[PDB]
């Protein structure tokens, strides 16, 4: 049918953990442990806090994350104690080493960072500081061993509220794992075969430059390409970024990608179409997805209930006026209704082939779960767009953009 | 089978023959009351109308009769605005009937097209038009100018649509003497 509905359960998409442990729930990093973990050497730097804040800091990063006597229960497949046990990684933190800084914020933090001893440097401060100096800090420490992890006073205070104490610890240990050089999980690459190897470049705009966050189909390898623009990517900029991404893909893999998937928040432009077909010619298939986190659609249920529709419902409408042999490429439109993913998504697909719409729906869901910040329901988004935008935000502060290709996803995440 | 808030034509929109004049953004809003549905682009107003009288048409507003033949798929921004003006005309015409035996605080007005229906901030029905695949799609949603159960939204859109077209499953927006967009509520087959 040209306009119908379906259900795409999360169980068809997955994330991978140690020894090819597969489950659709990212929060099960606690069960199967991080896919490819490292050792965390933590450095907590509390900034302008009262006593209670320091007791909360010790509670969180020492008793919950280290002390086994403090038998903290973890979300799923819990035993007790802290990071070193459930995650099977070397977590090292000395509560006596917590640095007290009376804040110029960036300089004060930097003088207190010891890259030779620590891999991670958590920075604790109120919301105003964690907002003004988050991206600036992330950019100012590009290439250094230490990766910073901001935590607000409010989140520490929520450790006293019981229910919040049982949900905040995991979406900070997972980020500590990521920022230590570890991989919480990689995407189940098998999902990209219902759509019909490749790239998933996300396009963002540093407000100006265009940011292409290129990544493999399992998100294992990532790379940012930044091209000045003299919203859409001009033909020359898109050609340059595509050539660079294909070079990187062939360098890491050994071949050119047989399928390029692209994400934008705007509809495909004519220049983008010409550039795509110029670099990729006709041999490499391309899918392009204009994604919006809102939809005027409002689907209702039957009267036997209060007009409630089961979550996972997806509305497909395949544009019949599609012909890729004459410059017509808008293939279909997918509306992923959702309550997990907090926002509904609408996807305008452009395609040079008969791209399966439920295929791109699965792409978008597996890219939702691919995000290592998948815990913290609020922040659930498409991975490539999300970190393309993170890189766009922090590029305003990076001075030598020649380091952009070397930047890691963990320096923005 | 599921329902939705979408009404849409069951066939591709026939070519829209539109008259035009040269000059405005407020003018198109005001003349939509009388039956002149226009869109302002390239410093011109491209419009259709239900007024079957040239003299009255000129008095309300030279007029290039049948000056353009728009294809909505290639001119989505034209057809969307013309359709919105036509929908506003329809609602304006039905407002007198709607506000017959109701309290003064329970009377509907127009502020897309928004029907501010219950004021305390007022809750109303917002209309959106999209051209896709050379077809017209109209969405009606409960809005506030907040989070409510699906039932209180379904029963709200049902009231607003029944008090416009008299039946919840369709709506007819007249663009001119010869063109009428007939939209039917869509039941997305599972």
Coordinates of C-alpha atoms in Angstrom, one line a residue:
Chain A
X1 CA 0.0 0.0 0.0
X2 CA 1.1 3.6 -0.7
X3 CA 0.0 5.0 2.7
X4 CA -0.2 2.5 5.6
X5 CA 1.0 1.9 9.2
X6 CA 3.1 -0.8 10.8
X7 CA 5.0 -1.7 14.0
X8 CA 8.8 -1.9 14.1
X9 CA 9.8 -3.3 17.5
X10 CA 13.1 -2.4 19.1
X11 CA 14.0 -6.1 19.3
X12 CA 14.8 -6.1 15.6
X13 CA 17.5 -3.5 16.2
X14 CA 20.3 -4.1 18.6
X15 CA 23.6 -3.0 20.2
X16 CA 26.7 -5.2 20.7
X17 CA 28.7 -5.8 23.9
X18 CA 31.6 -8.0 25.0
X19 CA 31.9 -11.3 23.1
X20 CA 29.1 -10.4 20.7
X21 CA 26.4 -10.1 23.4
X22 CA 23.4 -8.6 21.6
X23 CA 20.3 -7.0 23.1
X24 CA 18.1 -4.1 22.0
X25 CA 18.4 -2.3 25.4
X26 CA 21.4 0.0 25.6
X27 CA 20.9 0.3 29.4
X28 CA 22.0 -3.4 29.5
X29 CA 25.6 -2.3 29.3
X30 CA 25.5 -3.2 33.0
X31 CA 24.5 -6.8 32.1
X32 CA 26.8 -7.6 29.2
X33 CA 29.5 -5.0 30.3
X34 CA 31.0 -2.4 27.9
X35 CA 31.7 -3.8 24.4
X36 CA 35.4 -2.7 24.4
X37 CA 36.3 -1.1 27.8
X38 CA 39.3 0.6 29.2
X39 CA 40.5 1.8 32.6
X40 CA 39.1 5.0 34.2
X41 CA 41.5 7.2 36.2
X42 CA 39.1 9.8 37.6
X43 CA 39.8 13.4 38.7
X44 CA 36.9 15.2 40.3
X45 CA 37.1 19.0 40.6
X46 CA 34.3 20.5 42.6
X47 CA 33.9 24.3 41.9
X48 CA 32.2 26.7 44.3
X49 CA 30.3 24.2 46.4
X50 CA 29.2 24.1 50.0
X51 CA 29.9 21.2 52.4
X52 CA 26.8 19.2 51.5
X53 CA 27.9 19.3 47.8
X54 CA 31.3 17.8 48.8
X55 CA 29.6 15.0 50.8
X56 CA 27.4 14.3 47.8
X57 CA 30.5 14.3 45.6
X58 CA 32.1 11.7 47.8
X59 CA 28.9 9.7 48.0
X60 CA 28.6 9.5 44.2
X61 CA 32.1 9.1 43.0
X62 CA 33.5 7.2 46.0
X63 CA 30.9 5.2 47.9
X64 CA 28.6 4.4 44.9
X65 CA 31.4 3.9 42.4
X66 CA 34.1 2.4 44.6
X67 CA 33.0 1.2 48.0
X68 CA 31.6 -2.3 48.0
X69 CA 30.2 -1.9 51.5
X70 CA 27.9 0.7 50.0
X71 CA 25.8 -1.9 48.2
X72 CA 24.3 0.3 45.5
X73 CA 21.7 -1.5 43.3
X74 CA 22.2 -0.9 39.6
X75 CA 19.4 -0.7 37.0
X76 CA 19.6 -4.2 35.4
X77 CA 21.4 -7.4 36.3
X78 CA 22.9 -5.8 39.4
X79 CA 25.1 -7.3 42.0
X80 CA 26.4 -4.4 44.1
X81 CA 29.1 -1.9 44.9
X82 CA 30.3 0.2 42.0
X83 CA 32.0 0.5 38.6
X84 CA 34.9 -2.0 39.1
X85 CA 32.5 -4.9 39.6
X86 CA 29.5 -4.6 37.4
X87 CA 31.4 -3.2 34.4
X88 CA 34.6 -5.2 34.8
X89 CA 36.9 -2.2 34.3
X90 CA 39.6 -0.6 36.5
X91 CA 37.9 2.4 38.2
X92 CA 40.3 4.4 40.3
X93 CA 39.3 7.4 42.4
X94 CA 40.8 8.8 45.6
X95 CA 38.2 10.9 47.6
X96 CA 41.1 12.7 49.4
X97 CA 42.3 14.1 46.1
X98 CA 39.1 16.0 45.2
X99 CA 40.2 19.5 44.2
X100 CA 38.5 22.5 45.6
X101 CA 38.5 25.5 43.2
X102 CA 37.1 28.9 44.0
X103 CA 36.5 30.4 40.6
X104 CA 39.0 32.1 34.3
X105 CA 37.0 28.9 34.8
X106 CA 39.0 27.1 32.1
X107 CA 42.4 28.2 33.3
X108 CA 41.5 27.3 36.9
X109 CA 40.4 23.8 35.7
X110 CA 43.5 23.4 33.5
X111 CA 46.0 24.1 36.3
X112 CA 44.3 21.3 38.3
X113 CA 44.4 18.7 35.5
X114 CA 47.1 16.1 35.6
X115 CA 47.1 14.2 32.3
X116 CA 50.0 12.0 33.4
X117 CA 47.9 10.4 36.2
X118 CA 44.3 10.6 35.1
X119 CA 42.4 9.8 31.9
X120 CA 39.1 11.4 32.9
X121 CA 38.5 14.7 34.7
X122 CA 34.9 15.2 36.0
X123 CA 34.1 18.9 36.6
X124 CA 31.4 19.6 39.1
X125 CA 29.7 23.1 39.3
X126 CA 26.3 24.7 39.3
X127 CA 24.1 24.8 36.2
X128 CA 25.3 28.3 35.1
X129 CA 29.0 27.2 35.0
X130 CA 28.2 23.8 33.5
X131 CA 26.4 25.6 30.6
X132 CA 28.7 28.5 30.0
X133 CA 31.9 26.4 30.1
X134 CA 30.9 23.0 28.7
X135 CA 31.6 23.3 25.0
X136 CA 34.5 25.7 25.7
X137 CA 36.1 23.2 28.0
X138 CA 35.5 20.3 25.5
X139 CA 37.2 22.3 22.7
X140 CA 40.1 23.6 24.9
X141 CA 41.1 20.0 25.7
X142 CA 41.2 18.6 22.2
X143 CA 44.2 16.3 21.8
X144 CA 45.0 16.1 25.5
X145 CA 44.8 12.8 27.3
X146 CA 42.2 14.0 29.8
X147 CA 38.6 14.1 28.7
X148 CA 36.2 16.1 30.9
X149 CA 32.8 15.0 32.1
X150 CA 30.6 17.8 33.5
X151 CA 28.1 17.1 36.4
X152 CA 25.8 19.8 37.9
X153 CA 25.0 20.4 41.5
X154 CA 21.4 19.6 40.8
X155 CA 22.2 16.0 39.7
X156 CA 24.2 15.5 42.8
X157 CA 21.4 16.8 44.9
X158 CA 19.0 14.4 43.2
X159 CA 21.0 11.5 44.7
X160 CA 19.0 12.1 47.9
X161 CA 15.6 11.6 46.3
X162 CA 15.8 7.8 46.1
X163 CA 14.2 7.3 42.7
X164 CA 16.7 9.7 41.1
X165 CA 19.6 8.0 43.1
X166 CA 18.6 4.8 41.2
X167 CA 18.7 6.3 37.7
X168 CA 21.5 9.0 37.6
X169 CA 24.5 6.8 38.4
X170 CA 24.3 4.7 35.2
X171 CA 24.1 7.7 32.8
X172 CA 27.4 8.9 34.2
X173 CA 29.3 5.7 34.5
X174 CA 28.5 4.9 30.9
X175 CA 29.8 8.4 29.9
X176 CA 32.9 7.8 32.0
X177 CA 33.4 4.5 30.1
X178 CA 33.1 6.4 26.8
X179 CA 35.4 9.2 27.8
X180 CA 38.1 6.8 29.1
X181 CA 38.5 5.4 25.5
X182 CA 36.0 2.6 25.9
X183 CA 33.1 1.7 23.6
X184 CA 29.8 1.1 25.4
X185 CA 28.5 -0.7 22.3
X186 CA 28.4 -0.7 18.6
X187 CA 25.4 -0.9 16.3
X188 CA 24.2 -4.2 15.0
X189 CA 25.5 -3.8 11.4
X190 CA 23.0 -6.5 10.2
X191 CA 20.2 -3.9 10.3
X192 CA 21.5 -2.3 7.1
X193 CA 20.4 -5.1 4.8
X194 CA 16.6 -4.8 5.2
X195 CA 17.1 -1.3 3.7
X196 CA 17.4 -3.0 0.3
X197 CA 29.1 -1.6 4.5
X198 CA 28.8 2.1 3.9
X199 CA 28.9 5.4 5.7
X200 CA 26.5 7.3 7.9
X201 CA 27.5 10.9 7.5
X202 CA 25.5 13.4 9.5
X203 CA 25.3 17.0 8.3
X204 CA 25.3 19.9 10.8
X205 CA 26.1 23.6 10.4
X206 CA 28.6 25.5 12.7
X207 CA 27.0 29.0 12.5
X208 CA 30.1 29.5 8.9
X209 CA 31.2 25.9 8.3
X210 CA 29.5 22.6 7.4
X211 CA 30.2 19.6 9.7
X212 CA 30.1 16.1 8.3
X213 CA 30.2 13.5 11.1
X214 CA 31.2 10.4 9.1
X215 CA 31.0 7.0 10.7
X216 CA 30.8 3.3 9.7
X217 CA 27.6 1.4 9.9
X218 CA 28.4 0.1 13.4
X219 CA 29.6 3.5 14.7
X220 CA 33.0 1.9 15.6
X221 CA 35.0 4.4 13.5
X222 CA 34.1 8.0 13.4
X223 CA 35.6 11.2 11.9
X224 CA 34.6 14.8 11.6
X225 CA 35.2 16.7 8.4
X226 CA 34.7 20.5 8.5
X227 CA 34.3 22.5 5.3
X228 CA 33.9 26.3 5.2
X229 CA 30.8 27.6 3.5
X230 CA 31.1 30.6 1.3
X231 CA 20.3 25.3 5.2
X232 CA 22.3 23.3 2.7
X233 CA 25.9 22.4 1.8
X234 CA 27.0 24.0 -1.5
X235 CA 28.1 21.8 -4.3
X236 CA 31.9 22.4 -3.9
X237 CA 31.8 21.9 -0.1
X238 CA 29.7 18.7 -0.4
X239 CA 32.0 17.3 -3.1
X240 CA 35.0 18.0 -0.9
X241 CA 33.5 16.5 2.2
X242 CA 32.3 13.4 0.4
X243 CA 35.7 12.9 -1.2
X244 CA 37.3 13.2 2.2
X245 CA 34.9 10.8 3.8
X246 CA 35.3 8.2 1.0
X247 CA 39.1 8.5 1.4
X248 CA 38.8 7.9 5.1
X249 CA 36.4 5.0 4.6
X250 CA 38.7 3.3 2.1
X251 CA 41.7 4.0 4.4
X252 CA 40.0 2.3 7.3
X253 CA 38.1 -0.5 5.4
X254 CA 40.0 -0.8 2.1
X255 CA 37.2 -0.1 -0.4
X256 CA 34.8 2.7 -1.3
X257 CA 31.4 2.5 0.5
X258 CA 28.8 0.7 -1.5
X259 CA 26.0 2.7 0.2
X260 CA 26.1 6.3 1.6
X261 CA 23.5 7.2 4.2
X262 CA 23.1 10.9 5.0
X263 CA 21.1 12.8 7.6
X264 CA 20.0 16.4 7.6
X265 CA 17.4 18.6 9.3
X266 CA 16.5 20.2 6.0
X267 CA 15.2 18.8 2.7
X268 CA 17.7 17.8 0.1
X269 CA 18.9 20.7 -2.0
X270 CA 19.7 20.8 -5.7
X271 CA 23.4 21.5 -5.0
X272 CA 23.6 18.5 -2.6
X273 CA 22.0 16.3 -5.3
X274 CA 24.5 17.4 -7.9
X275 CA 27.4 16.9 -5.5
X276 CA 26.2 13.5 -4.4
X277 CA 25.8 12.3 -8.0
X278 CA 29.1 13.9 -9.0
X279 CA 31.3 12.2 -6.3
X280 CA 29.3 9.0 -6.3
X281 CA 28.5 9.0 -10.0
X282 CA 26.0 6.1 -10.5
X283 CA 27.9 3.2 -9.0
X284 CA 27.5 3.9 -5.2
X285 CA 23.9 4.0 -3.9
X286 CA 22.9 6.9 -1.7
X287 CA 20.1 7.4 0.8
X288 CA 19.5 10.9 2.2
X289 CA 17.2 11.5 5.1
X290 CA 15.7 14.9 6.1
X291 CA 14.6 14.3 9.7
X292 CA 12.3 16.5 11.8
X293 CA 11.5 15.8 15.5
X294 CA 7.9 17.0 15.0
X295 CA 5.0 15.9 13.0
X296 CA 1.5 17.4 12.5
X297 CA 0.2 13.8 12.4
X298 CA -1.8 12.7 15.4
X299 CA -2.8 9.1 15.2
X300 CA -5.7 7.9 17.4
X301 CA -6.7 4.5 18.7
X302 CA -10.0 2.6 18.8
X303 CA -12.9 3.3 21.1
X304 CA -12.5 0.1 23.2
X305 CA -9.7 2.1 24.8
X306 CA -9.2 5.9 25.3
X307 CA -8.0 6.2 21.7
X308 CA -4.5 4.9 22.6
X309 CA -2.1 3.7 19.9
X310 CA 0.6 1.2 20.8
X311 CA 4.1 2.7 20.8
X312 CA 6.3 1.7 17.9
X313 CA 3.7 2.7 15.3
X314 CA 5.2 3.9 12.1
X315 CA 3.2 5.6 9.3
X316 CA 4.7 5.0 5.8
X317 CA 3.6 6.9 2.7
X318 CA 5.6 6.2 -0.4
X319 CA 5.6 9.0 -2.9
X320 CA 4.5 7.6 -6.2
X321 CA 5.9 10.6 -8.2
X322 CA 9.4 9.2 -7.8
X323 CA 11.8 8.5 -10.7
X324 CA 15.6 8.7 -10.1
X325 CA 16.4 8.7 -13.9
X326 CA 15.3 12.3 -14.4
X327 CA 16.3 14.1 -11.1
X328 CA 13.2 13.1 -9.0
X329 CA 14.5 11.4 -5.8
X330 CA 12.0 12.1 -3.0
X331 CA 11.1 8.4 -2.4
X332 CA 8.8 8.3 0.7
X333 CA 8.0 9.7 4.1
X334 CA 8.1 7.9 7.4
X335 CA 6.4 9.2 10.6
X336 CA 7.8 7.3 13.7
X337 CA 5.2 8.0 16.4
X338 CA 6.8 7.7 19.9
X339 CA 6.2 8.4 23.5
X340 CA 11.8 4.6 23.9
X341 CA 12.2 7.9 22.0
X342 CA 10.7 11.0 23.6
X343 CA 9.8 12.8 20.3
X344 CA 8.1 11.8 17.1
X345 CA 10.2 11.8 13.9
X346 CA 9.3 12.6 10.3
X347 CA 11.7 11.4 7.6
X348 CA 11.8 12.6 4.0
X349 CA 13.8 10.0 2.2
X350 CA 15.7 10.8 -1.0
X351 CA 17.1 7.8 -2.8
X352 CA 18.6 6.6 -6.1
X353 CA 17.0 3.1 -5.6
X354 CA 13.8 1.5 -4.3
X355 CA 14.9 2.2 -0.7
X356 CA 12.7 0.3 1.8
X357 CA 10.9 2.9 4.1
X358 CA 10.7 0.6 7.1
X359 CA 14.4 0.1 6.4
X360 CA 15.1 3.8 7.0
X361 CA 12.9 3.6 10.0
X362 CA 15.1 0.9 11.4
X363 CA 18.1 3.0 10.5
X364 CA 16.7 5.9 12.5
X365 CA 15.9 3.7 15.5
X366 CA 19.3 2.0 15.5
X367 CA 20.9 5.4 15.3
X368 CA 18.7 6.5 18.3
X369 CA 20.0 3.6 20.3
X370 CA 23.5 3.8 19.0
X371 CA 24.0 7.0 21.0
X372 CA 26.1 6.3 24.1
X373 CA 24.0 8.8 26.0
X374 CA 20.9 6.6 25.3
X375 CA 20.3 6.5 29.1
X376 CA 19.0 9.9 30.2
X377 CA 15.8 9.5 28.1
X378 CA 15.6 13.3 27.6
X379 CA 18.7 13.3 25.4
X380 CA 17.6 10.5 23.0
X381 CA 18.3 11.6 19.4
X382 CA 19.7 10.3 16.1
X383 CA 23.4 9.7 16.8
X384 CA 25.0 11.2 13.6
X385 CA 22.9 14.4 13.7
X386 CA 23.4 14.7 17.4
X387 CA 27.2 14.6 17.4
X388 CA 27.4 16.5 14.1
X389 CA 25.7 19.3 16.0
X390 CA 27.9 18.8 19.1
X391 CA 30.9 19.2 16.8
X392 CA 29.3 22.2 15.2
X393 CA 28.8 23.8 18.6
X394 CA 32.3 23.2 19.8
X395 CA 34.0 24.2 16.5
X396 CA 33.3 27.8 17.4
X397 CA 36.1 27.5 20.0
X398 CA 38.6 25.3 18.2
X399 CA 41.3 27.4 16.7
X400 CA 43.4 25.0 14.6
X401 CA 40.7 23.3 12.5
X402 CA 43.5 21.2 10.9
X403 CA 43.1 18.9 14.0
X404 CA 39.4 18.3 13.2
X405 CA 40.1 14.9 11.4
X406 CA 42.0 13.6 14.4
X407 CA 39.2 14.6 16.9
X408 CA 37.4 11.7 18.5
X409 CA 33.7 11.3 19.2
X410 CA 34.7 11.0 22.8
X411 CA 36.1 14.6 22.9
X412 CA 32.6 16.0 22.1
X413 CA 30.6 13.3 23.8
Chain B
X1 CA -7.0 0.0 11.2
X2 CA -6.1 3.2 12.9
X3 CA -7.5 6.7 12.5
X4 CA -5.7 10.1 12.5
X5 CA -6.2 13.8 12.2
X6 CA -5.5 13.8 8.4
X7 CA -8.0 14.6 5.7
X8 CA -6.7 14.4 2.1
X9 CA -7.8 14.2 -1.5
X10 CA -8.2 10.8 -2.9
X11 CA -6.8 11.9 -6.3
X12 CA -4.0 14.1 -7.5
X13 CA -5.0 17.8 -7.5
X14 CA -6.1 18.9 -11.0
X15 CA -4.2 21.9 -12.4
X16 CA -5.3 25.1 -10.6
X17 CA -6.2 27.9 -13.0
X18 CA -5.5 31.1 -11.1
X19 CA -6.2 34.7 -11.9
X20 CA -3.7 37.3 -10.8
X21 CA -3.1 41.0 -10.1
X22 CA 0.0 43.1 -9.5
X23 CA 0.9 45.2 -6.5
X24 CA -0.7 43.0 0.1
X25 CA 0.0 40.3 2.7
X26 CA -2.8 41.8 4.9
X27 CA -5.0 42.2 1.8
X28 CA -5.1 38.5 1.1
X29 CA -6.1 37.8 4.7
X30 CA -9.0 40.3 4.6
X31 CA -10.4 39.4 1.2
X32 CA -10.6 35.7 2.2
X33 CA -13.8 36.6 4.1
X34 CA -15.6 37.3 0.8
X35 CA -14.4 34.4 -1.3
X36 CA -11.1 35.6 -2.8
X37 CA -8.3 33.1 -2.0
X38 CA -4.8 34.4 -3.0
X39 CA -1.1 34.0 -2.4
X40 CA 1.4 36.8 -2.6
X41 CA 4.5 36.0 -4.6
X42 CA 6.7 38.0 -7.1
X43 CA 4.9 41.2 -5.9
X44 CA 1.6 39.7 -7.4
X45 CA -1.5 38.2 -5.8
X46 CA -2.3 34.9 -7.6
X47 CA -5.9 34.1 -6.5
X48 CA -8.9 31.9 -7.2
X49 CA -12.5 32.9 -6.2
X50 CA -16.0 31.7 -5.8
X51 CA -17.5 35.1 -6.7
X52 CA -19.3 34.5 -10.0
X53 CA -19.6 38.2 -10.8
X54 CA -16.7 40.2 -12.4
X55 CA -18.1 43.6 -11.3
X56 CA -18.4 42.5 -7.6
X57 CA -15.0 40.9 -7.8
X58 CA -13.4 44.1 -8.9
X59 CA -15.4 46.1 -6.3
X60 CA -14.2 43.9 -3.5
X61 CA -10.6 44.2 -4.8
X62 CA -6.8 44.9 -13.9
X63 CA -7.6 41.2 -13.2
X64 CA -5.8 38.8 -15.4
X65 CA -8.5 36.1 -15.7
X66 CA -7.0 32.6 -16.0
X67 CA -3.5 34.1 -16.1
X68 CA -1.7 31.1 -14.7
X69 CA -2.1 27.3 -14.6
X70 CA -0.4 26.2 -11.3
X71 CA 0.6 22.6 -10.7
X72 CA 0.5 22.3 -6.9
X73 CA 3.4 19.8 -6.7
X74 CA 5.7 22.3 -8.4
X75 CA 4.1 25.2 -6.6
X76 CA 3.3 23.8 -3.1
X77 CA 3.7 27.3 -1.5
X78 CA 1.1 28.7 -3.8
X79 CA -1.5 26.0 -3.4
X80 CA -1.0 25.8 0.4
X81 CA -1.8 29.5 0.9
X82 CA -4.8 29.5 -1.5
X83 CA -6.2 26.4 0.3
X84 CA -5.7 28.1 3.7
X85 CA -7.5 31.2 2.6
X86 CA -10.4 29.0 1.2
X87 CA -10.6 27.1 4.5
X88 CA -10.7 30.4 6.4
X89 CA -13.6 31.5 4.1
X90 CA -15.5 28.3 4.9
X91 CA -15.1 28.6 8.6
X92 CA -16.0 32.3 8.5
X93 CA -19.2 31.4 6.6
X94 CA -20.1 28.7 9.2
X95 CA -19.3 30.9 12.2
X96 CA -22.7 32.6 12.2
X97 CA -24.5 29.2 12.4
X98 CA -22.0 27.9 15.0
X99 CA -22.5 30.9 17.3
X100 CA -26.3 30.7 17.5
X101 CA -27.2 29.3 20.9
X102 CA -24.0 29.4 22.8
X103 CA -22.6 31.5 25.7
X104 CA -20.5 34.5 24.8
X105 CA -17.5 32.9 26.4
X106 CA -18.1 29.7 24.4
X107 CA -18.2 31.3 21.0
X108 CA -15.7 30.4 18.3
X109 CA -13.4 32.8 16.4
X110 CA -10.4 32.8 14.1
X111 CA -7.0 34.1 15.0
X112 CA -2.4 28.2 9.2
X113 CA -6.0 28.6 10.5
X114 CA -6.7 28.6 14.2
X115 CA -10.1 28.4 15.8
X116 CA -9.7 29.7 19.3
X117 CA -12.7 27.8 20.7
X118 CA -12.5 28.0 24.6
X119 CA -10.8 30.9 26.3
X120 CA -10.0 31.1 30.0
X121 CA -4.8 31.1 27.0
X122 CA -7.4 29.6 24.9
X123 CA -7.8 26.0 23.5
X124 CA -8.6 25.7 19.9
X125 CA -8.1 23.7 16.6
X126 CA -5.1 24.5 14.4
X127 CA -5.1 23.6 10.7
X128 CA -2.1 22.8 8.6
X129 CA -1.9 22.1 4.9
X130 CA 0.8 20.1 3.1
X131 CA 1.2 19.3 -0.6
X132 CA 2.7 15.8 -1.0
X133 CA 2.7 13.7 -4.2
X134 CA 0.6 16.3 -5.9
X135 CA -2.1 15.8 -3.2
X136 CA -3.4 18.0 -0.4
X137 CA -3.3 17.0 3.2
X138 CA -5.1 18.9 6.0
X139 CA -4.2 18.3 9.7
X140 CA -6.4 19.5 12.5
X141 CA -4.9 19.4 16.0
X142 CA -6.0 20.7 19.4
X143 CA -3.6 23.5 20.5
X144 CA -3.3 26.1 23.2
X145 CA -2.5 29.8 22.8
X146 CA -1.8 21.4 27.4
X147 CA -1.0 17.7 27.5
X148 CA -4.3 15.9 27.4
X149 CA -5.5 12.3 27.0
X150 CA -6.0 11.1 23.4
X151 CA -9.8 11.0 24.0
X152 CA -10.0 14.7 24.9
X153 CA -8.2 15.5 21.6
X154 CA -10.2 13.1 19.4
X155 CA -13.5 14.5 20.8
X156 CA -12.2 18.0 20.3
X157 CA -11.2 17.6 16.7
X158 CA -14.5 15.8 16.1
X159 CA -16.5 18.7 17.4
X160 CA -14.5 21.3 15.4
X161 CA -14.9 19.4 12.2
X162 CA -18.6 18.5 12.7
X163 CA -19.3 22.2 13.4
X164 CA -17.7 23.1 10.0
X165 CA -18.6 20.4 7.5
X166 CA -21.5 18.6 9.4
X167 CA -19.7 15.3 9.1
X168 CA -16.4 14.3 10.8
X169 CA -15.2 12.1 7.9
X170 CA -14.9 14.7 5.2
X171 CA -14.5 18.4 4.4
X172 CA -15.0 20.3 1.1
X173 CA -12.9 23.5 0.6
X174 CA -14.1 25.4 -2.4
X175 CA -11.4 27.2 -4.4
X176 CA -13.5 28.5 -7.2
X177 CA -16.6 27.9 -9.3
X178 CA -14.8 25.0 -11.0
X179 CA -12.3 23.7 -8.4
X180 CA -13.3 22.2 -5.1
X181 CA -10.8 20.2 -2.9
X182 CA -12.7 17.3 -1.4
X183 CA -10.8 15.8 1.6
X184 CA -11.7 12.6 3.5
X185 CA -10.4 11.6 6.9
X186 CA -7.8 8.9 6.3
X187 CA -7.9 5.6 8.1
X188 CA -4.3 4.3 7.9
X189 CA -4.6 0.6 7.1
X190 CA -2.4 -1.5 9.4

